[PDB]
Design a protein around this ligand. Structure first.
Ligand code: GDP
Ligand code: ZN
Lengths: 93, 132, 414
């Protein structure tokens, strides 16, 4: 009676010599302070569904705060990623 | 060095499955709670079929356990009626030995990734069968 | 206790169509190669089969009933453990006349091979012949001619053909090749073959000092769907190290690489990456060398490798000298007739501006003739080609009846 599923499809593609490696980074940074500032987002889980396509899962106690941080994440993936030559746009859903 | 070659040639030949037949009556008996096919080995032998296979099938249909004698005998861990054995046995012939084109019973049994085929030594056709 | 070692030599299996060269590859390895099936997935998007096996021997038994494929030794009526000889792998080749261009690609991974020849059909068949002279050109010297399906022919016959397969052989680069008659279906005389490939196709000397060079024939995305973000694997490039050797944590580059045509002409700029891991079959290693299909797990975005994308490329040490050219000079040599056809007709001269298909490694490309001297031509390749060393071999094909045909070869003059 607590969880609320909040996902969304994104595009992630790089040509950096350490592909998957730069992807690991941006996420493990753009996805920093979320579970802490704007807090009880019971959990976070970015993952791949296909090829350049990925998704982000944010289960929290309240839907209003769900999309609150979920946007703050993507918000930063785009930014941080563009700061490391990591091309990540969005296919909202 | 045809000699070298011919030598190998003759060797394969005498490795073939003979040349070119009612079916020996399959002898069956009982001993407590076992049904035993005295010649399950000879039988299979004369239909060019691997014992494990007739065994696997025939057993599966029976829903009983068993293995083969060190002297080619089938010991079915269950006492079944001589009759039903045949009924299930012919069914085995129909589906895994008899050619569809002419019904010879003079066949091989190919196997590939997941498709086995009956291969007639008479008509030459291949009945695809459900690998089991 | 046998050694889990990587393949030593690659023996491809060539021949016509329907001639058993797949039933055979398993009548040996005991593996059914997917060259003959429809695969919707990762990996193989080309009709090429692969099959690895170990090769032991029981010095307690007699030949040929001596050689085994497993640790056991029951197969000879003994028990004194057999000593591990080598570990070989077969490349299953497409015998279909059409598919010919994907054979010349499997050949450039070939170390030595076997030319399967059915006994029930006249000799030599189209691809039986084409494929043969293909081997000649590409550069193989180790050849065993397998006489198959005799278990459906008279001794009086198997011999009749035997004679021909031989006279056909005179004057040829394989003028004294073996002819081990077998029956892949019944798995009979396979052991005589294992002695043959043990006798006539031996691992060649590997100059482990040369420039590392691998030919790519596939690529895929390993990551299953769903995989979290921290268990993601980089792309995986597969193929064969053809010379030298690579090892984990290294510096490699794929060529021609990533295409880039922006605001002008197009151009291909190298894809740089580090080697993430090595694998031959189900065993991971720490360095890969000639012999066997490799799986070089890299670091790049899975997108780059996911669709058998990088097939036709080569992997190199990041730091190397490998010209990616668009125009290339070739001191070609045309053939007599169009082997692999049916209407034995002469090969017409390479006319200028004519279009031709050039095979060069795992790669295949079309171009247009721009120069045409006595024994040298130059061509414009739609896609550039990476020439890892001067004067590497190339096969020249020319579409004839809506169908492409082999008519020659040459040396790529860097
Ligand atoms: N009788 C007989 N059939 C064989 C033998 N080897 C292969 N075959 C069969 O002949 C066909 C062609 O074999 P396949 O392995 O697909 O060879 P491929 O067409 O060269 O790649 C299949 O029907 C096989 O089961 C053999 O030694 N004897
Ligand atoms: Zn029939």
């Amino acid at each position: 009676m607590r969880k609320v599923k909040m996902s969304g499809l994104i595009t992630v593609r790089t040509n950096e010599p350490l592909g998957v490696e730069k992807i690991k980074e941006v996420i493990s940074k753009a996805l920093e302070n979320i579970e802490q500032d704007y807090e009880s987002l019971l959990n976070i889980k970015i993952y791949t569904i296909g090829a350049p396509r990925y998704r982000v899962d944010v289960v929290g106690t309240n839907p209003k705060e769900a999309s609150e941080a979920l946007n703050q994440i993507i918000s930063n993936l785009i930014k941080i990623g563009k700061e490391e030559n990591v091309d990540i746009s969005v296919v909202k859903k | 060095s045809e000699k070298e070659y011919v030598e190998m040639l003759d060797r394969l030949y005498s490795k073939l499955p003979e040349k070119g037949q009612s079916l020996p009556n399959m002898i069956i008996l009982n001993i407590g709670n076992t049904t035993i096919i005295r010649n399950f080995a000879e039988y299979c032998d004369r239909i060019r079929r691997e014992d494990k296979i007739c065994m696997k099938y025939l057993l599966k249909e029976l829903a009983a356990p068993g293995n083969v004698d060190d002297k080619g005998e089938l010991v079915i861990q269950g006492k079944f009626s001589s009759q039903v054995i045949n009924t299930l046995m012919e069914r085995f012939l129909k589906a895994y030995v008899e050619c569809s084109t002419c019904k010879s019973l003079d066949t091989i049994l190919k196997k590939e990734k997941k498709s086995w085929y009956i291969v007639c030594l008479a008509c030459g056709a291949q009945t695809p069968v459900k690998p089991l | 206790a046998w050694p889990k070692v990587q393949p030593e030599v690659n023996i491809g299996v060539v021949g016509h169509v329907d001639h058993g060269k797949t039933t055979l590859v398993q009548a040996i390895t005991g593996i059914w190669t997917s060259k003959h099936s429809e695969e919707l997935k990762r990996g193989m998007t080309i009709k090429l089969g692969y099959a690895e096996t170990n090769i032991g021997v029981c010095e307690s038994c007699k030949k040929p009933e001596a050689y085994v494929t497993e640790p056991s030794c029951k197969s000879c009526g003994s028990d004194d453990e057999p000593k591990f000889l080598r570990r070989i792998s077969f490349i299953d080749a497409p015998g279909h006349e059409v598919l010919m261009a994907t054979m010349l690609s499997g050949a450039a991974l070939m170390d030595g091979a076997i030319l399967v020849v059915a006994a029930n059909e006249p000799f030599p068949q189209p691809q039986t012949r084409e494929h043969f002279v293909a081997l000649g050109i590409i550069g193989v010297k180790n050849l065993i001619i397998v006489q198959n399906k005799v278990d459906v022919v008279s001794k009086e016959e198997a011999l009749s053909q035997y004679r021909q397969i031989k006279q056909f052989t005179k004057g040829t680069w394989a003028e004294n090749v073996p002819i081990i008659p077998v029956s892949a279906l019944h798995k009979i005389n396979i052991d005589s073959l294992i002695e043959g490939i043990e006798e006539y196709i031996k691992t060649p000397y590997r100059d482990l000092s040369q420039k590392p060079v691998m030919l790519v024939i596939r690529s895929f995305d390993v990551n299953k769907p769903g995989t979290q973000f921290n268990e993601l694997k980089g792309g995986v490039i597969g193929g064969s190290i053809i010379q030298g050797l690579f090892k984990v944590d290294q510096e490699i580059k794929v060529l021609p690489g990533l295409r880039v045509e922006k605001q002008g002409k197009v151009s291909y700029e190298p894809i740089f990456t580090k080697i993430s891991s090595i694998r031959f079959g189900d065993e991971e290693f720490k360095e890969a060398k000639p012999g066997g299909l490799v799986a070089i797990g890299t670091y790049l975005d899975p997108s780059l490798t996911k669709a058998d994308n990088l097939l036709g490329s080569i992997i190199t040490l990041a730091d190397a000298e490998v010209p990616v050219l668009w125009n290339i000079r070739i001191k070609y040599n045309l053939l007599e007739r169009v082997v692999g056809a049916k209407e034995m007709l002469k090969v017409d001269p390479i006319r200028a501006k004519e279009t031709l298909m050039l095979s060069v490694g795992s790669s295949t490309t079309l171009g247009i003739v721009t120069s045409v001297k006595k024994d040298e031509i130059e061509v414009e390749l739609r896609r550039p080609v990476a020439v890892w060393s001067n004067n590497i071999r190339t096969v020249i094909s020319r579409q004839i009846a809506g169908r492409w045909r082999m008519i020659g070869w040459g040396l790529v003059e860097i």
